[PDB]
């Protein structure tokens, strides 16, 4: 967000309108990896084994 904000403070306004889709899709993918993710050897019941 700081990166988007930096571009906004400089005045490019390139992310206005449809250009904003790039930060949005990126932010969703990052969310999936950090909250759910996958376990190591301590979690034996991985979906394919169960």
């Amino acid at each position: 967000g700081g990166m988007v904000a930096m571009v906004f403070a400089s005045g490019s306004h390139v992310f206005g309108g449809i250009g904003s889709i790039f930060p949005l899709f990126m932010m969703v993918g990052i969310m999936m990896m950090m909250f759910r993710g996958m376990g190591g050897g301590q979690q034996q019941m991985s979906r394919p084994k169960l």
């Binding site: 790039f22 899709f25 990126m26 993918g29 990052i30 990896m33 993710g37 394919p48 084994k49």
Partner: protein, 50 residues
């Protein structure tokens, strides 16, 4: 009239040797360990979108 024939001491026959053999146990199939394939796929998308 026949020719005489006296039977001598029997010659040694070839000796038979038995054998006890234990078979090798077959190999065991490796259980299905599994990689979190989707995680690295999202990863390469995120770094590319950046």
């Amino acid at each position: 009239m026949k020719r005489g024939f006296a039977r001598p001491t029997p010659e040694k026959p070839p000796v038979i040797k038995p054998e006890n053999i234990v078979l090798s146990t077959p190999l065991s199939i490796p259980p299905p360990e599994g990689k979190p394939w989707w995680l690295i796929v999202v990863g390469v998308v995120v770094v590319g979108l950046l």
